[PDB]
């Protein structure tokens, strides 16, 4: 009936002065815009059908044409930025916000879906959706005693749309919009559905990626223990944003970083640092590097949890990106560590894997490793054990690598390598 219609037939049906003919043509447009292979989105836009679909959103007297036009517009809004702009330019934002209060849950869900796609385009459309007042009617749809009474797909769509309102930077979402959404977000973080948990974690990861004031807003809500619990989940779609959120929080103050340690996050790192997914290993090592950039008592907790052999591990064998992050963790550790903590790092066998990475064709990693060498030598200077460390670097072929770096293209590498040879190897 409404299967494989031409754009011309859809236009002829929608332009008729018959609500039923318009409904059949709108359903046909929705089915066309729903096909897997190349939906004719640009053809539907060029035919001028977006203003017709937006006007059909207001037809309270005909709920099926509201549903079909909402679905057709959602398919267009899910496309490119230009295709989302076309939906917005047609005045769809206030029309979709009015449908959030619809007594038909399938129409209300379609409006949630459409607003998520519009907000998801970027900062300007996100903030425009907020200015048209979408947050209050969206939050009211979740104002129930128990989230488990809501339809699974409906809750998943609401969570996803809320995460897009938390998403993007330059600028970050308005502070008052973040404050309004956060209590509902804390609630969705304690829900049992894995998809709701994944998208709630992604929302929290977006809110914790920025200045320490943004991290504080989130950390103040007491979500850190729940994020650590989700960090230990079996589902990779939950662990990925949960680790991203924990990683973002430890970029903050020593006090914010401490909340992560107090919640027992370090006990999950033996498995995260050996995770078969390289991106988990990479982001877990990035997280470790920011914790080793903390207080000496925070470095001590890394030591106590037996995580230094795990850092020797990732430095010895991992994808290059994870090895570069391990280098950072070592340099941060040697920068803020006590002599005893730096001595411990050497006893765990950090020197040989640290030297082997001086062969990398990466200027930044080489500078990072050279700074760590200097730091370790400074600790050996305080104990008169510089000779023991010099022999250690000589034996694993580290001296050959530093001597060769005395002819490196980069100025900082050239100077740092010449300094070490002259101070401890001459």
């Amino acid at each position: 009936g409404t299967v494989n219609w031409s754009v011309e037939d859809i236009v002829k049906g929608i332009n008729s002065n018959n609500l039923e003919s318009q409904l059949q043509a709108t359903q046909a447009a929705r089915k066309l815009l729903s096909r897997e292979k190349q939906p004719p989105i640009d053809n539907i836009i060029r035919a001028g059908l977006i203003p017709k679909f937006v006007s059909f959103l207001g037809k309270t007297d005909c709920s099926p044409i509201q549903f079909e036009s909402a679905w057709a517009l959602t398919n267009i809004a899910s496309g490119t930025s230009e295709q989302t702009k076309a939906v917005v330019d047609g005045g769809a934002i206030p029309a979709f916000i009015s449908l959030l209060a619809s007594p038909h849950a399938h129409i209300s869900e379609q409006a949630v879906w459409a607003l998520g796609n519009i907000a998801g385009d970027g900062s300007a459309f996100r903030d425009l959706v907020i200015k048209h007042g979408a947050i209050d009617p969206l939050l009211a749809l979740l104002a129930v005693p128990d989230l488990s009474t809501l339809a699974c797909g409906y809750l998943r769509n609401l969570t996803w749309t809320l995460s897009n309102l938390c998403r993007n930077k330059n600028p970050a979402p308005p502070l008052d919009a973040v404050e309004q959404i956060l209590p509902t977000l804390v609630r969705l973080l304690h829900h049992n559905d894995p998809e709701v948990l994944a998208d709630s974690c992604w929302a929290i990861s977006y809110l914790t990626d920025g200045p320490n004031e943004r991290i504080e807003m989130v950390v103040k809500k007491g979500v850190v223990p729940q994020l650590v619990k989700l960090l230990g989940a079996t589902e990779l779609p939950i662990v990925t944003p949960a680790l991203r959120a924990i990683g973002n929080i430890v970029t903050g103050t020593d006090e914010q970083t401490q909340k992560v340690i107090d919640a027992g996050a370090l006990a999950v790192f033996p498995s995260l640092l050996t995770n078969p997914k390289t991106n988990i290993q990479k982001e877990a090592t990035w997280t470790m590097s920011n914790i080793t950039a903390g207080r000496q008592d925070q470095i001590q907790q890394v030591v106590n949890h037996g995580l230094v052999p795990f850092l020797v591990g990732v430095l010895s064998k991992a994808d290059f990106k994870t090895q570069k992050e391990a280098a950072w963790a070592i340099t941060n550790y040697t920068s803020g560590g006590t002599v005893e903590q730096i001595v411990y790092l050497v006893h765990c066998g950090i020197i040989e894997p640290l030297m082997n990475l001086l062969s990398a064709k990466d200027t930044k990693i080489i500078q990072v490793i050279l700074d760590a060498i200097s730091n370790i030598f400074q600790a050996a200077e305080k104990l008169g054990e510089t000779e023991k460390l010099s022999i250690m670097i000589e034996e694993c072929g580290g001296l050959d690598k530093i001597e060769a770096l005395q002819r490196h293209e980069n100025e900082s590498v050239y100077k740092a390598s010449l300094n070490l040879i002259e101070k401890y190897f001459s």
């Binding site: 729903s34 897997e36 899910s78 496309g79 796609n117 998801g120």
Partner: peptide, 6 residues
């Protein structure tokens, strides 16, 4: 992220 409904 944006999302289509099939």
């Amino acid at each position: 992220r944006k999302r289509k409904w099939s």
